[PDB]
Amino acid sequence: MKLTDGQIRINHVSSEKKRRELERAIFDELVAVVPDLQPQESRSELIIYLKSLSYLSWLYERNEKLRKQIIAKHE
Amino acid sequence: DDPVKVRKWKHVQMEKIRRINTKEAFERLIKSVRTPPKENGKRIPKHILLTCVMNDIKSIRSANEALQHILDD
DNA sequence: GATTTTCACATGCAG
DNA sequence: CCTGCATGTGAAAAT
């Protein structure tokens, strides 16, 4: 049967709420795994994204540095 | 004049500017992340993209640890 | 078609 | 007072 206005409205609210709760959980995972990202920053999207990108860049840089060191230990 | 309405206006626009700057930071982040190919030309929701971020972080940490053990052998 | 999901928005309010 | 984050909702994209 056709959903009533009230049923449509709260389905809308809950769908939004669940997705925000989903995003926030990932924010908390990023706080946990990004050294320089602090729990106080766990709901500041701009800072999460910038510090995550910085961490990615450093991780790739480290990867380069190690590969060269192996290529060096084999001379 | 009405400083109250000006302050209301400024807060509205500065929220929209915060959203713009947040979106720019997000797009910069996502351009450096292995993301799924757009099947059927359908947008990828932010939270799916965020999972790709977490995956890439974990994936490269591991690779680096594996590289570290090789360097210690 | 109707419903779900997502994005963007204007606003309330803690600190 | 200011701002940064939280909320439900309009409109649009996806299902």
Contact residues of A toward B, CB < 8 A: 19, 22-23, 26-27, 29-30, 33-34, 45-46, 49-50, 52-53, 55-57, 59-60, 62-63, 66-67, 69-70, 73
Q: B26, A63: Cβ pair inside 8 Å? A: no
DSSP chain A: -PPPHHHHHHHHHHHHHHHHHHHHHHHHHHHHH-TT--GGGTT-HHHHHHHHHHHHHHHHHHHHHHHHHHHHHT-
Print the domain residue range for A27: 1-75
Distance CA B29, CA B32 (A): 6
Selected residue of B29, B49, B73 to mutate for chain A interface (largest A Cβ count, 10 A) = B29
Indicate yes or no: strand D within 7 A of the C-beta of B38.
Answer: no
**What resolution (Å)?**
2.2
Give how many domains chain A has, as a whole number: 1
Solved by what technique? Answer: X-ray
How far is Cα B46 from Cα B38, in angstroms, rounded to an integer?
Answer: 14
Q: Quick one: DSSP state of residue B32? A: T
Q: What is the DSSP string of B53-73?
A: HHHHHHHHHHHHHHHHHHHT-
Of A55, A22, A58, residue with least CA distance to A38: A55
- The reply to whether A2 Cβ lies less than 7 angstroms from strand C is yes
Closest chain B C-alpha to A31 CA, distance in angstroms: 11
Task: Return the nearest residue to C2, CA–C1'.
Answer: A2
State the burial class of residue B14 (Cβ atoms within 10 Å of its Cβ: 0-12, 13-18, 19+): exposed
**DSSP-assigned letter for residue B41:** G
Task: Report the alpha-carbon distance of residue A72 to residue B11 in Å, rounded.
Answer: 56
